[PDB]
Design an enzyme around this catalytic site. Structure first.
Site, PDB file in Angstrom:
ATOM      1  N   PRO A  33       0.754  -1.141  -0.225  1.00  0.00           N
ATOM      2  CA  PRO A  33      -0.061   0.139  -0.118  1.00  0.00           C
ATOM      3  C   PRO A  33       0.785   1.205   0.050  1.00  0.00           C
ATOM      4  O   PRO A  33       0.336   2.254  -0.201  1.00  0.00           O
ATOM      5  CB  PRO A  33      -0.879  -0.258   1.265  1.00  0.00           C
ATOM      6  N   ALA A  35       4.354   1.172   2.004  1.00  0.00           N
ATOM      7  CA  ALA A  35       4.892   1.054   2.954  1.00  0.00           C
ATOM      8  C   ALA A  35       6.546   1.578   2.564  1.00  0.00           C
ATOM      9  O   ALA A  35       6.981   2.073   3.501  1.00  0.00           O
ATOM     10  CB  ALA A  35       4.910  -0.303   3.740  1.00  0.00           C
ATOM     11  N   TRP A  36       6.859   0.737   1.731  1.00  0.00           N
ATOM     12  CA  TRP A  36       8.541   1.032   1.305  1.00  0.00           C
ATOM     13  C   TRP A  36       8.717   2.465   0.556  1.00  0.00           C
ATOM     14  O   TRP A  36       9.479   3.001   0.586  1.00  0.00           O
ATOM     15  CB  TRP A  36       8.758  -0.311   0.387  1.00  0.00           C
ATOM     16  N   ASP A  62       2.586  -1.345  -8.958  1.00  0.00           N
ATOM     17  CA  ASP A  62       1.898  -2.561  -8.299  1.00  0.00           C
ATOM     18  C   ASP A  62       0.644  -2.726  -9.162  1.00  0.00           C
ATOM     19  O   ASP A  62       0.369  -1.685  -9.811  1.00  0.00           O
ATOM     20  CB  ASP A  62       1.769  -2.214  -6.769  1.00  0.00           C
ATOM     21  N   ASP A  79       1.614  -4.145 -14.666  1.00  0.00           N
ATOM     22  CA  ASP A  79       2.358  -5.460 -14.184  1.00  0.00           C
ATOM     23  C   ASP A  79       3.676  -5.223 -14.473  1.00  0.00           C
ATOM     24  O   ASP A  79       4.101  -4.717 -15.339  1.00  0.00           O
ATOM     25  CB  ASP A  79       1.692  -6.510 -15.137  1.00  0.00           C
ATOM     26  N   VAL A  80       4.735  -5.556 -13.525  1.00  0.00           N
ATOM     27  CA  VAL A  80       5.976  -5.373 -13.550  1.00  0.00           C
ATOM     28  C   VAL A  80       6.754  -6.377 -14.538  1.00  0.00           C
ATOM     29  O   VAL A  80       7.415  -5.867 -15.142  1.00  0.00           O
ATOM     30  CB  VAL A  80       6.577  -5.771 -12.154  1.00  0.00           C
ATOM     31  N   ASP A 104       9.078  -5.861  -3.383  1.00  0.00           N
ATOM     32  CA  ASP A 104       8.430  -6.562  -2.398  1.00  0.00           C
ATOM     33  C   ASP A 104       7.034  -7.423  -2.942  1.00  0.00           C
ATOM     34  O   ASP A 104       5.977  -7.652  -2.328  1.00  0.00           O
ATOM     35  CB  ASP A 104       7.783  -5.458  -1.409  1.00  0.00           C
ATOM     36  N   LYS A 144      12.315  -9.294  -2.301  1.00  0.00           N
ATOM     37  CA  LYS A 144      11.547 -10.096  -1.287  1.00  0.00           C
ATOM     38  C   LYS A 144      11.364 -11.544  -1.841  1.00  0.00           C
ATOM     39  O   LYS A 144      10.785 -11.661  -3.004  1.00  0.00           O
ATOM     40  CB  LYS A 144      10.300  -9.358  -0.712  1.00  0.00           C
TER      41      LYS A 144
END
Ligand SMILES: [K+]
Ligand SMILES: [K+]
Ligand SMILES: [K+]
Ligand SMILES: [K+]
Ligand SMILES: [K+]
Ligand SMILES: [Mg+2]
Ligand SMILES: [Mg+2]
Ligand SMILES: [Mg+2]
Ligand SMILES: [Mg+2]
Ligand SMILES: [Mg+2]
Ligand SMILES: [Mg+2]
Ligand SMILES: [Mg+2]
Ligand SMILES: [Mg+2]
Ligand SMILES: [Mg+2]
Ligand SMILES: [Mg+2]
Ligand SMILES: [Mg+2]
Ligand SMILES: [Mg+2]
Ligand SMILES: [Mg+2]
Ligand SMILES: [Mg+2]
Ligand SMILES: [Mg+2]
Ligand SMILES: [Mg+2]
Ligand SMILES: [Mg+2]
Ligand SMILES: [Mg+2]
Ligand SMILES: [Mg+2]
Ligand SMILES: [Mg+2]
Ligand SMILES: [Mg+2]
Ligand SMILES: [Mg+2]
Ligand SMILES: [Mg+2]
Ligand SMILES: [Mg+2]
Ligand SMILES: [Mg+2]
Ligand SMILES: [Mg+2]
Ligand SMILES: [Mg+2]
Ligand SMILES: [Mg+2]
Ligand SMILES: [Mg+2]
Ligand SMILES: [Mg+2]
Ligand SMILES: [Mg+2]
Ligand SMILES: [Mg+2]
Ligand SMILES: [Mg+2]
Ligand SMILES: [Mg+2]
Ligand SMILES: [Mg+2]
Ligand SMILES: [Mg+2]
Ligand SMILES: [Mg+2]
Ligand SMILES: [Mg+2]
Ligand SMILES: [Mg+2]
Ligand SMILES: [Mg+2]
Ligand SMILES: [Mg+2]
Ligand SMILES: [Mg+2]
Ligand SMILES: [Mg+2]
Ligand SMILES: [Mg+2]
Ligand SMILES: [Mg+2]
Ligand SMILES: [Mg+2]
Ligand SMILES: [Mg+2]
Ligand SMILES: [Mg+2]
Ligand SMILES: [Mg+2]
Ligand SMILES: [Mg+2]
Ligand SMILES: [Mg+2]
Ligand SMILES: [Mg+2]
Ligand SMILES: [Mg+2]
Ligand SMILES: [Mg+2]
Ligand SMILES: [Mg+2]
EC number: 2.1.1.-
Length: 181
Positions: A33, A35-36, A62, A79-80, A104, A144
């Site tokens: 959401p 955080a990083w 994301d 999409d990554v 992540d 991650k």
RNA sequence: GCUAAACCUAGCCCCAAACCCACUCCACCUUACUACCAGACAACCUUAGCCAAACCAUUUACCCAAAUAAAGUAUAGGCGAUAG
RNA sequence: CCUAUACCUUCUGCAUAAUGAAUUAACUAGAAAUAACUUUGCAAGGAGAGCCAAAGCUAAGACCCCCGAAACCAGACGAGCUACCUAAGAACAGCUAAAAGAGCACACCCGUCUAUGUAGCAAAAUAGUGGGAAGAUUUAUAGGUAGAGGCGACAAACCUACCGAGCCUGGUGAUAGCUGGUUGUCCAAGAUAGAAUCUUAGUUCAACUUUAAAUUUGCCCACAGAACCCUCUAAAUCCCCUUGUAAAUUUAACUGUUAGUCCAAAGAGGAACAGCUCUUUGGACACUAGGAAAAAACCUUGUAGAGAGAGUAAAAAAUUUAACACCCAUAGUAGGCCUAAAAGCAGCCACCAAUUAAGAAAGCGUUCAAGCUCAACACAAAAAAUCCCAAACAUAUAACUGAACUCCU
RNA sequence: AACCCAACACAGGCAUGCUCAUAAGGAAAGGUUAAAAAAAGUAAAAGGAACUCGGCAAAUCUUACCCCGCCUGUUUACCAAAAACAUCACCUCUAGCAUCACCAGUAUUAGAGGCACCGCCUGCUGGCUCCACGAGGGUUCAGCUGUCUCUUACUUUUAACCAGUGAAAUUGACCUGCCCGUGAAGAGGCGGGCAUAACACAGCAAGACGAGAAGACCCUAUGGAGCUUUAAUUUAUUAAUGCAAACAGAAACCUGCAUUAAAAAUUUCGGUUGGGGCGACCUCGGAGCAGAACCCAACCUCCGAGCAGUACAUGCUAAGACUUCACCAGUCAAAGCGAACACUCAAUUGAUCCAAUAACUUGACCAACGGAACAAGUUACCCUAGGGAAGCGCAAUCCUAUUCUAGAGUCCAUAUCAACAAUAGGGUUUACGACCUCGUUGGAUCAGGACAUCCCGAUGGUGCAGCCGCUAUUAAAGGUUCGUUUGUUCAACGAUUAAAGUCCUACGUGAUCUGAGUUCAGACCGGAGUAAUCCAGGUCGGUUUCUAUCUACUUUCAAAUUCCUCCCUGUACGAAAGGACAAGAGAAAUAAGGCCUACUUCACAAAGCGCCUUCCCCCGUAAAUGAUAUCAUCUCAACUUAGUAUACCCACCCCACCCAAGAACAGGGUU
């Protein structure tokens, strides 16, 4: 102070290894959401909070919608693994390059973590395949990962393309690569 | 009707009076009750505390040699519990 | 058949599923004097030196419990267990290796994990699995350091199977506002204002209660009388002659009680409807019986025995709830305004009018119209988790039943 | 000597030399039976961690990392073996010296400590890297297996029975039932109903707030103890100096006194506010504050007081009274003497002892204000004595259902939905710092019940064409899955299902089991404190036991539900797209009740992974006739219609044997 408990994980890594400094361009894969993304902006001065330090850039990608954040630019939905997002990412970053890649991304837990191990590894490999396009030489790469045997294959490919690879340890495992070739 | 139940001495207590025991033979301070070799070793020095003061910190009766009386008086004392 | 919720103790209240008791026999818990009272002697004196005396003085009778800490101190006893140390001994297969606080692995030491065991084989073990096993190793023997201490690769470990300070004896019948207990019969009187306190688990004083003694008023209560405020405003209360009645004050000697609980009533807690907490008034309960199902606090009723008499007190819930019009409507006009046009019904200004009698439209339906009806003309709910819960009964004249209250022997 | 230490003829303890499987030393089975449960093993189809807090146990022998510590070693003997202590190495501090320690030593030495090798950067000390190693804490590959899907068979112990010997905790008395209600708030004993010949044996663990402890939770004591300190009171003790004394001519020793440090000793933690942090409070006066004699509402709410001014007879005496519910203290006061011609002020204050003083008089934020002459922290190492620890009808708030008919739904209150409110039921909160925080629950097993229905079923409405939704009535017979933890402890995620319902039941259920929290004896990280130590914080490790006395119960002996395919059917329906009911056939799953022909675990048998069988309705509504109310109207009007059980069981030699019967007993067979 932060949107998700995962923010403390990035701070703990940054405190020991010093991967974020003002003036750095940071890509946040699976930024939702946010955080990083919040952690990155403060460290790299992406919002220009400190006039005496260079202003960095933070980009969050994301699948889900991400609420706006001061000093951070977000691309959603995207999409990554989609080549379209990679082209859009380059056009937004200054100089069409990034200094630090943070990841992540986590696919949905299919109820079998052993299956989820290889699925997450392939996502990291897909990011690693497109990493040269986004990352600049001598950069930092953090992803991650879920512990498993296929992490060695990811570790082996990172070892060839990076000067140094570190293993950082919920049951999550983080691979920290620096000094990109 | 079984288990049981019952008994009257043994001896003792408090006074009085009067001042008490301690070598048959053998062994006994070394590992006591061990027959039989050179040691040096020497005793003495305010009791405290519980407790009472409704805590506690100064303090708080303890035969000291005639029963009674003087008298719980004179005195002492965080002049107070108490002591005398 | 009918009636009946064990005892002790601790709390306002225990059938309580709060405390104690398997039971039997024995043992086990109120010790004291100044005063006062009572009964004798003598008497302005009493007493078998002392001491008191403005009727006292002498003597007798008569009132003050049991068990239990964790602690403190003094003097002894303890390092055959264990902690460390001293003296002089001993043990360590095999294999790989190398002159190893090396590896593997017996003896040996240790005790990771699991299971069994849990008054057991065992006040710490058994089985399997484990750590070390030539060393800071393990172990036999003798000696040493002792409690205000020793010892300790610090676990506040260990110092003879309960060491944040050993054990034993003594002071010691330590102390404990705390817990528990406190033994024959019968009768009598007997409950809820407060203040202080290192005090709210206590105590002292007062109030209340008890006994004895003296004395003369006590209670109930006719008028009269007790404030103005911030404007006004309750139930009442004090005082108090009569009268009904028999208590009251004082003196002497002391114990005990002192958050009470609930009900009715008025209030208090930031201006808080209940509940909670806390005051005030009254009742009841910790005192008997009857009745509301069982029921400390509601109602009835209290003074105590026996009866195979009698009269009464309180004392049994009621209630079953929704119909409805019939007939008719043509027309001066889409009354004007504003609105794309909104016409009776988007809004509004006006409210007249033909015909026997019809709103310049009361609701609906149209973007707006259309369509309709009406007016008018004639004609007051309920649902939860073991299993509903007395049985029943609309119709023979309100008397009867009913106490430890009352009467009767 | 068959021997010692452990209360025992005790499964424990016990030095050395030989034997290293014996040449020596011994006996696990009292007899029987083959139940349950429990213990120990062995074997297993297919799958192989799906079990679980965790690959614990077991099997097989099994890889690669992370965290911490360097390593070997050491510790809480009896719940913690570790991340803790020790450890070479490094660093700091102190000491210039011999006849009992250090030491028969002398700065490269000895002592007191920190830290934990090495290597590297750095200060001129801090931070990292890293070799091996670990019964340390996590994670994971592969393999492995009854850990599980889903249990089964066998052996031994136990067990049950016969014989011998023979405990313990426990126990007020018991002639010891169920359902509702009530009650000191959880009833075998009370109330109202129901049930009920008497007795053993074997199981079970729902209840008897079961038994024996302990832990924990706050509270109390003018009860203890350990530790710590800038708590109070001291320097006796010891050491160092000064001074007197003493001597010699200077000194030293000794003793007295005084001043310093060291170390040690004694004693204590005042109440009030759920607890803690931060604050406030304790005496006196006024109001809310008891409306009318007095008194009386704590807590709580709000404003004050700890003086000042004017007198200088604010002199001396003396009847009679008030009095803060006691005492203490406090207040008014005629007359008289002596002078002149009981001061204002709601509070404006403090006892005794003692000290000062010739005397008169004076002395405490003794404010904890009826006052002890002078004493603080901490205990999770704690100890002792105790006391407490399910339930509380009408105001506020939240939810549900109706009511109200505003408002959305193109039009349209009422297909749905709904504000401001009200009415019923349920839950929660509540008397004061307009401070801040903190004070039992999952899982396994077995489930009972409610209906406010998640699925299956029946029936209305629809903005219901048809499938499929929405909404409402009715229905509790039956059913309601398996996994993973990144968005972790019942929240997301994955795959499914006719559906993965809301609840109650002392987390329903711990004398059936287990995990975590409330938290503790060890230990670090962050924070607080001078320290001891503390923190609802982060993390690692970590002991309750129970032989069933009583109640209840131990074959309801028997009626089955669901899905899918196909059929109707590509039919009704619709422009197509799409797309059904009802009726029937077949197949599968689950549950219940059985079985061994095959298959499989295995073999005179048991068992599933195998096979076989499985049978009733539902009550919401929809219609006819037909009055009250000559129409109409399905009628809490008379009336009519639709959906408004059988099976099983059944008689009355026995010594002994056998059994497909069984713990014992019983039962069947013995032609
Ligand atoms: K010794
Ligand atoms: K033999
Ligand atoms: K270890
Ligand atoms: K039970
Ligand atoms: K006080
Ligand atoms: Mg004392
Ligand atoms: Mg004390
Ligand atoms: Mg009972
Ligand atoms: Mg008992
Ligand atoms: Mg007796
Ligand atoms: Mg003392
Ligand atoms: Mg020894
Ligand atoms: Mg030696
Ligand atoms: Mg060897
Ligand atoms: Mg070795
Ligand atoms: Mg070894
Ligand atoms: Mg040691
Ligand atoms: Mg420590
Ligand atoms: Mg400790
Ligand atoms: Mg005593
Ligand atoms: Mg009486
Ligand atoms: Mg005081
Ligand atoms: Mg009168
Ligand atoms: Mg009578
Ligand atoms: Mg009409
Ligand atoms: Mg009668
Ligand atoms: Mg009478
Ligand atoms: Mg046997
Ligand atoms: Mg069994
Ligand atoms: Mg198998
Ligand atoms: Mg595996
Ligand atoms: Mg699971
Ligand atoms: Mg799992
Ligand atoms: Mg896991
Ligand atoms: Mg294992
Ligand atoms: Mg180590
Ligand atoms: Mg090494
Ligand atoms: Mg231990
Ligand atoms: Mg040990
Ligand atoms: Mg252990
Ligand atoms: Mg260490
Ligand atoms: Mg080790
Ligand atoms: Mg016994
Ligand atoms: Mg019975
Ligand atoms: Mg009941
Ligand atoms: Mg039985
Ligand atoms: Mg007290
Ligand atoms: Mg203390
Ligand atoms: Mg008075
Ligand atoms: Mg006071
Ligand atoms: Mg006072
Ligand atoms: Mg601790
Ligand atoms: Mg069904
Ligand atoms: Mg229903
Ligand atoms: Mg239970
Ligand atoms: Mg362990
Ligand atoms: Mg049992
Ligand atoms: Mg069909
Ligand atoms: Mg008709
Ligand atoms: Mg009809």
């Amino acid at each position: 102070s932060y949107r998700c408990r995962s923010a403390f994980k990035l701070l703990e890594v940054n405190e020991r290894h010093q991967i974020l400094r003002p003036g750095l361009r940071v890509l946040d894969c699976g930024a939702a959401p946010g955080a990083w993304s919040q952690v990155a902006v403060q460290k790299v001065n992406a919002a220009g909070t400190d006039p005496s330090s260079p202003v960095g850039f933070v980009l969050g990608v994301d699948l889900l919608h991400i609420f706006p954040l001061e000093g951070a630019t977000f691309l959603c939905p995207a999409d990554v693994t989609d080549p379209r997002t990679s082209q859009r990412i380059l056009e937004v970053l200054p100089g069409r390059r990034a200094d630090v890649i943070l990841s992540d991304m986590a696919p949905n837990a299919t109820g079998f973590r052993d299956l989820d191990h290889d699925r997450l590894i392939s996502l990291c490999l897909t990011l690693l395949s497109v990493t040269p396009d986004i990352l600049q030489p001598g950069g930092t790469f953090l992803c991650k990962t879920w512990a498993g045997s296929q992490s060695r294959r990811l570790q082996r490919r990172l070892t060839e393309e990076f000067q140094n690879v570190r293993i950082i340890k919920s049951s999550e495992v983080y691979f920290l690569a620096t000094q990109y070739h």
